[PDB]
Amino acid sequence: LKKTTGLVGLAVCETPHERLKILYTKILDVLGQIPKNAAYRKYTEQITNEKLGMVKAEPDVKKLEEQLQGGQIEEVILQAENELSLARKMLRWKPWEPLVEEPPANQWKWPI
Amino acid sequence: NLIEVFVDGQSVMVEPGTTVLQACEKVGMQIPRFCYHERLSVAGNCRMCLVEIEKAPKVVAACAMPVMKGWNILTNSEKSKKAREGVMEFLLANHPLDCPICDQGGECDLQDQSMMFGSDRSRFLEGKRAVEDKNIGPLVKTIMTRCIQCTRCIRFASEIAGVDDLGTTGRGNDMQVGTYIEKMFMSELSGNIIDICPVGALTSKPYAFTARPWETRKTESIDVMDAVGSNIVVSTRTGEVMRILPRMHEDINEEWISDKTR
Amino acid sequence: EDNKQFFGRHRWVIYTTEMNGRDTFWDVDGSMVPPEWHRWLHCMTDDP
Amino acid sequence: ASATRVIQLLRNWASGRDLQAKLQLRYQEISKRTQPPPKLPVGPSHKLSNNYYCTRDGRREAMPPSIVMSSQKEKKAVTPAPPIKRWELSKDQPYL
Amino acid sequence: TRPTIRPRNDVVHKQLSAFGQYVAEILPKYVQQVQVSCFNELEIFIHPDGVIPVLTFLRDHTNAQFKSLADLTAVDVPTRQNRFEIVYNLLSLRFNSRIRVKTYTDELTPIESSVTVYKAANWYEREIWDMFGVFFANHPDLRRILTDYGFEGHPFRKDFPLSGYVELRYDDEVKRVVAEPVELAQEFRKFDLNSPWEAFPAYRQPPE
Amino acid sequence: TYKFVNMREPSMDMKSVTDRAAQTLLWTELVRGLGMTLSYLFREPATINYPFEKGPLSPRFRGEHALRRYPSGEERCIACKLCEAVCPAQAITIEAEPRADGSRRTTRYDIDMTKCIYCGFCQEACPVDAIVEGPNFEFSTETHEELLYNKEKLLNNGDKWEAEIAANIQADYLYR
Amino acid sequence: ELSGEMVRKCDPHIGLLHRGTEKLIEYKTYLQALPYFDRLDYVSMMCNEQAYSLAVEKLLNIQPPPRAQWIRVLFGEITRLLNHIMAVTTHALDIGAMTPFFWMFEEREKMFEFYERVSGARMHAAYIRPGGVHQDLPLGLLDDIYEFSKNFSFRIDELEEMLTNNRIWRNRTVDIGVVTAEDALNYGFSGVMLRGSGIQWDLRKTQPYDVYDQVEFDVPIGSRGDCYDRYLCRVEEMRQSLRIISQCLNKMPPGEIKVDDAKVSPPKRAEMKTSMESLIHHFKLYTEGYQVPPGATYTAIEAPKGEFGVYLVSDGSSRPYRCKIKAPGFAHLAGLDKMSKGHMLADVVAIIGTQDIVFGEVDR
Amino acid sequence: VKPIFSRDMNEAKRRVRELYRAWYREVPNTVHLFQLDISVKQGRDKVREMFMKNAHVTDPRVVDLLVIKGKMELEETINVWKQRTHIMRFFHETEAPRPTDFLSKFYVGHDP
Amino acid sequence: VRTSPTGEKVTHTGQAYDDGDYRRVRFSDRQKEVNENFAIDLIAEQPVSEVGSRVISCDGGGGALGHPRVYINLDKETKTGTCGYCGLQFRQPH
Amino acid sequence: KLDITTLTGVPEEHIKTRKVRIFVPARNNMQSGVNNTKKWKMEFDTRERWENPLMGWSSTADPLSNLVLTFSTKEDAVAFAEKNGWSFDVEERKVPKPKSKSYGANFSWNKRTRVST
Numbered sequence A: 001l002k003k004t005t006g007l008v009g010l011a012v013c014e015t016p017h018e019r020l021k022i023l024y025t026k027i028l029d030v031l032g033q034i035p036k037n038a039a040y041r042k043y044t045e046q047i048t049n050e051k052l053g054m055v056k057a058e059p060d061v062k063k064l065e066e067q068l069q070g071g072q073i074e075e076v077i078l079q080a081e082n083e084l085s086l087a088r089k090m091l092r093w094k095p096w097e098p099l100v101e102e103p104p105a106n107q108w109k110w111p112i
Numbered sequence B: 001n002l003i004e005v006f007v008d009g010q011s012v013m014v015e016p017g018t019t020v021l022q023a024c025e026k027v028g029m030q031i032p033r034f035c036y037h038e039r040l041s042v043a044g045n046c047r048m049c050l051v052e053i054e055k056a057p058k059v060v061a062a063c064a065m066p067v068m069k070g071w072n073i074l075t076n077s078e079k080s081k082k083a084r085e086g087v088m089e090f091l092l093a094n095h096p097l098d099c100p101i102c103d104q105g106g107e108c109d110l111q112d113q114s115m116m117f118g119s120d121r122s123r124f125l126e127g128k129r130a131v132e133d134k135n136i137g138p139l140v141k142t143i144m145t146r147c148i149q150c151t152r153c154i155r156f157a158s159e160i161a162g163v164d165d166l167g168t169t170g171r172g173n174d175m176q177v178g179t180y181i182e183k184m185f186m187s188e189l190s191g192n193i194i195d196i197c198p199v200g201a202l203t204s205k206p207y208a209f210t211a212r213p214w215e216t217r218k219t220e221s222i223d224v225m226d227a228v229g230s231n232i233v234v235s236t237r238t239g240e241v242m243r244i245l246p247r248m249h250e251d252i253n254e255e256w257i258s259d260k261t262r
Numbered sequence C: 001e002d003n004k005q006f007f008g009r010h011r012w013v014i015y016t017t018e019m020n021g022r023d024t025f026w027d028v029d030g031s032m033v034p035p036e037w038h039r040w041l042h043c044m045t046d047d048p
Numbered sequence D: 001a002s003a004t005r006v007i008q009l010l011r012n013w014a015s016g017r018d019l020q021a022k023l024q025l026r027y028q029e030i031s032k033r034t035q036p037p038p039k040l041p042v043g044p045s046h047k048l049s050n051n052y053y054c055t056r057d058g059r060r061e062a063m064p065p066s067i068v069m070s071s072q073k074e075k076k077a078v079t080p081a082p083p084i085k086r087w088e089l090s091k092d093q094p095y096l
Numbered sequence E: 001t002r003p004t005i006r007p008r009n010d011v012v013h014k015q016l017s018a019f020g021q022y023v024a025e026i027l028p029k030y031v032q033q034v035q036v037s038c039f040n041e042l043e044i045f046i047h048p049d050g051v052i053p054v055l056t057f058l059r060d061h062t063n064a065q066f067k068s069l070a071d072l073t074a075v076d077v078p079t080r081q082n083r084f085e086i087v088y089n090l091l092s093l094r095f096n097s098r099i100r101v102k103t104y105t106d107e108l109t110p111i112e113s114s115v116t117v118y119k120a121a122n123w124y125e126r127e128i129w130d131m132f133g134v135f136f137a138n139h140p141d142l143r144r145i146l147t148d149y150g151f152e153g154h155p156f157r158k159d160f161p162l163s164g165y166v167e168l169r170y171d172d173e174v175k176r177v178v179a180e181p182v183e184l185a186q187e188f189r190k191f192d193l194n195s196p197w198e199a200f201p202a203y204r205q206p207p208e
Numbered sequence F: 001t002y003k004f005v006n007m008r009e010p011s012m013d014m015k016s017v018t019d020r021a022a023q024t025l026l027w028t029e030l031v032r033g034l035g036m037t038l039s040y041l042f043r044e045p046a047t048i049n050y051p052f053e054k055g056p057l058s059p060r061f062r063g064e065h066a067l068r069r070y071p072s073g074e075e076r077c078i079a080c081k082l083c084e085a086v087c088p089a090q091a092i093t094i095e096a097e098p099r100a101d102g103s104r105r106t107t108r109y110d111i112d113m114t115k116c117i118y119c120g121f122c123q124e125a126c127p128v129d130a131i132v133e134g135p136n137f138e139f140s141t142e143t144h145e146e147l148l149y150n151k152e153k154l155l156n157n158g159d160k161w162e163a164e165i166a167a168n169i170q171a172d173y174l175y176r
Numbered sequence G: 001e002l003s004g005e006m007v008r009k010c011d012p013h014i015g016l017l018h019r020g021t022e023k024l025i026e027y028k029t030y031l032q033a034l035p036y037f038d039r040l041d042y043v044s045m046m047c048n049e050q051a052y053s054l055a056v057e058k059l060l061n062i063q064p065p066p067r068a069q070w071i072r073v074l075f076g077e078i079t080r081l082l083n084h085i086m087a088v089t090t091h092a093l094d095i096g097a098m099t100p101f102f103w104m105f106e107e108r109e110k111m112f113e114f115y116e117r118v119s120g121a122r123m124h125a126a127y128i129r130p131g132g133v134h135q136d137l138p139l140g141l142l143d144d145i146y147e148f149s150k151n152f153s154f155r156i157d158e159l160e161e162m163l164t165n166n167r168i169w170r171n172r173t174v175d176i177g178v179v180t181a182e183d184a185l186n187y188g189f190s191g192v193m194l195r196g197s198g199i200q201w202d203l204r205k206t207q208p209y210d211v212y213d214q215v216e217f218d219v220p221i222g223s224r225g226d227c228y229d230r231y232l233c234r235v236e237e238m239r240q241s242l243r244i245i246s247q248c249l250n251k252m253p254p255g256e257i258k259v260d261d262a263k264v265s266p267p268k269r270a271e272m273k274t275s276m277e278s279l280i281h282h283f284k285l286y287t288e289g290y291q292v293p294p295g296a297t298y299t300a301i302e303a304p305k306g307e308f309g310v311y312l313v314s315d316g317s318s319r320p321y322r323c324k325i326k327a328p329g330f331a332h333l334a335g336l337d338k339m340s341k342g343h344m345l346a347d348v349v350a351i352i353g354t355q356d357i358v359f360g361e362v363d364r
Numbered sequence H: 001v002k003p004i005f006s007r008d009m010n011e012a013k014r015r016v017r018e019l020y021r022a023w024y025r026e027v028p029n030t031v032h033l034f035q036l037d038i039s040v041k042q043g044r045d046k047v048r049e050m051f052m053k054n055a056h057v058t059d060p061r062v063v064d065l066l067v068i069k070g071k072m073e074l075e076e077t078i079n080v081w082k083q084r085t086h087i088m089r090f091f092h093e094t095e096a097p098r099p100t101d102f103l104s105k106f107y108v109g110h111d112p
Numbered sequence I: 001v002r003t004s005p006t007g008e009k010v011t012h013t014g015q016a017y018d019d020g021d022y023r024r025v026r027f028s029d030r031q032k033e034v035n036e037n038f039a040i041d042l043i044a045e046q047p048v049s050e051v052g053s054r055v056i057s058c059d060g061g062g063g064a065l066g067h068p069r070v071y072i073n074l075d076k077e078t079k080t081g082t083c084g085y086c087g088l089q090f091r092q093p094h
Numbered sequence J: 001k002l003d004i005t006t007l008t009g010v011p012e013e014h015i016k017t018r019k020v021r022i023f024v025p026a027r028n029n030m031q032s033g034v035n036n037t038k039k040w041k042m043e044f045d046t047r048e049r050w051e052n053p054l055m056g057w058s059s060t061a062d063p064l065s066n067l068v069l070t071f072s073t074k075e076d077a078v079a080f081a082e083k084n085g086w087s088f089d090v091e092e093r094k095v096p097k098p099k100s101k102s103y104g105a106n107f108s109w110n111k112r113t114r115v116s117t
């Protein structure tokens, strides 16, 4: 058990595997409500499933950190919480819908 | 009977007899030039208009080559750029290092075309030529050492002014433009040779040394000396009129102004 | 010149008491240094 | 410096270091103000042949940005780049 | 070989292009165009309504962890109807990459504030409002920074003259520093430096 | 790649605890700082005796602008206005007319030392080495107007400082 | 807003030094625009010059010659030493130390002498330019830099002796201005401000710009995110800058100091005086300047006070269309209010010192 | 068209009324705090003139934006962010009167 | 350096304040800074070099320390060739 | 009917009393290049410039003396002027009319186009 994460404001999580499993499961549950053809759903499900499989497979925190390549595992759980929040807001925003409006005729022309 | 030609792969329809340079203008590409003035006749002596046509071994002068159907004009091919660099080097081999003191400095086609289509260094390791200056009048200050024998002045004097007093004397690198005798070039449109000259070989004597192009503020106006109504650009610096330059209006004055207006 | 002193004090000038019709016994200024000696004084050159 | 031995000993003991070895003031160790004339080398482009500017024209080789997607007309998830590798503690002095 | 010319890194180009397509697929509602510059910089073009959604997406790890707002600024191009081009620069420390998000606005159309997502855009949006005329809706405190307390015009706007319209001096009559119309002793000399010949044929706009 | 400042754990042995208690009670670290200050007291001061002693400068120093002449005495500047163009603060105002001899010379050359930023441009731009920032730096004035130099003032400065300026250019002309 | 000596609310008003730099840049050519960046951060002029040079080079698709790059990294580290000296010493002065100010400012005078020898200006030089460096190092300078660096370690050690372990100095800074790593990231902090909190990010390693990939140095990382940890980081960064300076002194390459392209870097004086092409290019470069291909870029460097960025957009002309300067002090001063909560006036002074804020950068 | 704060001209007028109220009641406090030598009536008359300057506006968004600017200026005046110089800048005391009849303009200078 | 009727020292540019001009007040208790050395006189004093080649080159002396090298044509016997920068005069012998 | 005049902060005199000229700049007749004639330009009316008593430098009181703007099309410039409430004059673009060039004509057997030299 590491004394400190090394980054101020981030505390060592006593039960990292369980926290990660719970967060990834909640992320998958939220993604389920997103329509099936939404690219966000597909990509997030892919990543979340890969992360969850790695978490379940590896019982050692250091080996799991090496495999995930997400930094220290506390950073991983913070990232998972961020993903959960993003998904929850994505459900409201519905970005998978078509473009709201085409830009004006020459709104992105440079040089003028 | 518009025919189809391609400039860098872009189809452009041009009337028969159109020069390659004109098709490049049609697609927007401005072929570098030193001897071609649309008002004047074609001469083909600058050689800066050498461009490569696809599947053609020899580059051609855009100003003097009528287009052929199906030709693809490669305006930025390696052959075209190399020809431009070589022509620019030959032009600058003997040209004097007069840019700081040349009145043309800052508005010189030679300078800009060297910066854009020429090499950035000189391989000329020999002495440069020098030419005795000719006196052609009280208006045109002449430094012939800077001349590039573009022949614009000669053709202009012959065709527009109608005074056949300017010509080329000698052959080879010793060829010199100017009256063989001490005659003075007198005409209403005499001052326009100053404008037509790409280099500062022919410059305005009253305007000499007074100001540099970037300083001047340009105001578009109309002349009042005659009832022709020639469009002019009044060049003013620090609230003082420095010179009067012609402004193009195809209906009224093509690109010329009278000596009195100028 | 005293090369033993550390750099910045190895060279110094004692201004004249009278220059260009001005009594400079007490009032001295850096501009009093002539240009030839200026470069030696300011270490621009090592040759006096 | 010109300090007496007694003052050198006192200052060194007060510092805990040998100040005489490293003196902040500069002495004859400084480079001479007058230097032999220099001869700066030429660059790669100073050649008399095979030096056409077209080959070495950097500016003209720039191009307008390539448009990956334009609104006006499974796949593996991707990242902007491979994840950063964790830094390694310095061998010379891991802890200051 | 070719010492003068800058070396090109195609791997980063491909990675940025692929990630740009990723972002385009994930949020087609807001993205209008994504482009990768040949100096390996990725720009995503977004409808003004998408500033908060797309930025929030970029911050949170959908394989993207841009958690630092490099800088926020605007570019005023008068020709376009939406004369202001709001520019966001983001940096992802996890992936050691940076991408740019760009949106447009008018003088009269507000754009949602990004203080919620990043919290570093407070002063940046305040500066945009003070210099450019862009108003950010829902900003915690929108007021002027870098301009005088009574400044009226919006500088950096390509319409504001460099010297401005007012000048300050001390007046002994009123014992106060007083503004006055600008009256330069030496008018700033406008130099017309652009050459009449085209420099870069690659960027030649169509003749139209 | 990275080093940890701090991140050190004090020893809990009785000797180390006694040492730290001694430091707190007996003010050891304060005494060390005091000793450092004492040593600096006994070290030689670095002050130079200005104005009698002057600070070192290199030949490339950028100071008061000075118009130079040819050895013949003719003024070098040839009214190219290149300096006015590069001037990043527009402190150079140049007016020229053909002089009686017919040469291209400057009727007006004003350098507003109140707007100039002493960038070193012009000195590196002038094709004839005319304007060359001189070694002089102590040219403060009691009025603003004295700092608005004129062509006469610039030429007088060049005549005054030419002996040093030529030597400095000779020293540095190979590096340029 | 102070209740007793406690700051309830800290509201920074800036613009007292706003000089419209970005507006003025639009009216100047790039070479004319270079001197502003020296002024932007008066303590770290050459670093800003290098950032602008990288921006213009990247837009130009031109690569500086290797010797120019090594000179740039050497003087960048010299500039970092100067800036850190000023930051640490003035922070100490503001909290009352006062003596290290003079001690280290003597070394600052010597580094200014190095600046003067290369460029002729003690500060705000135009040495680092797009396309490389203006002039090669005068003969004998590198060994003088060696003489300075071999003794600078004793000076910085003496500064540590005065401050690092002092009870008063620790009490003034041990826990003031604490910033959470996530809060630091969100508020846009950069440089020590991030590294003090413990996040490991240095643009010199993560995204090396010139030759920092070829040098070895250790990024100092803090553990408690306080003023004292930032002080420790700044001091260590100075030590690592000395190490980088040694490396750069040993392996300086021979050759050109500016790009061998006369359409971007001006030709040599002899060449412009003897060859027509060189004179033409000199004339156009010092009158019109070099046209930059149209485009936009944000180029960032690890400036001594943090991340310094220039958002430069070009319209294809010889004058930039828009130039936005990212000053690392801007975000730090923005977060000053968050840092100051629950602290006293003197702690506010200390926090202002720890965020190395130069208001030329902040106001632009 | 997206409304800034008001969907109609009437709502913008209501906001203008509020802003006017606030300025009106603030004026005496401004006179007292800044030690201005003007009377309260004089300041309020200047306020009225400034408000009538923008009266010709016939677009709700422009009115809303002007109201925002007015609110910012009022916040500056309520605090001591603006100095006495800034407050008196409304009263163009130093500037000499500029005559508006044609004959005076013709005499004075070339200005149209 | 001639003296104007007002007593002012006329400049090499020819600048002198007229008696009507009020700007002469600026020198009331101060001095008008005039450079005594006049370029035109000094350039006139220089002897005309005689060179036996039709075209000659003037660098202004000092090589890189002078002015850009230009080539002057000396064919005309009537008038001596004059350097654009240096102003020195050359002519062919006889 | 967009009006930003109140929001710009420009003083009323320059809003009302200034005539702005919308045009494509004519080619500098000294040069044959045409690249500087491809974008519309907005320029304000010229005003008084006088000599400074001290140095003779040209002094101005017109803030917009040096203000020039580039617009891709005439309509964009017109819209900008209208939104800013500046009286505008539009000069139609002048294009070189197509010319018929024949190098053969220089050696006409019977026509007058024959060139003496």
Ligand code: SF4
Binding pocket: B095, B096, B097, B098, B099, B100, B102, B103, B104, B105, B106, B108, B109, B110, B111, B146, B198, B199, B200, B201
């Ligand atoms: S005419 Fe010749 S000397 Fe004059 S500016 Fe042009 S290239 Fe230079």
Ligand code: SF4
Binding pocket: B146, B147, B148, B149, B150, B151, B152, B153, B154, B177, B196, B197, B198, B199, B201, B202
């Ligand atoms: S004098 Fe001028 S116009 Fe006549 S041929 Fe020579 S360069 Fe051409």
Ligand code: SF4
Binding pocket: F065, F083, F086, F087, F088, F089, F090, F091, F092, F111, F115, F116, F117, F118, F119, F120, F121, F122, F123
């Ligand atoms: S040093 Fe001063 S006078 Fe010379 S170019 Fe720079 S700003 Fe202008």
Ligand code: FES
Binding pocket: B033, B034, B035, B036, B043, B044, B045, B046, B047, B048, B049, B050, B061, B062, B063, B064
């Ligand atoms: S001008 Fe075109 S070939 Fe010479």
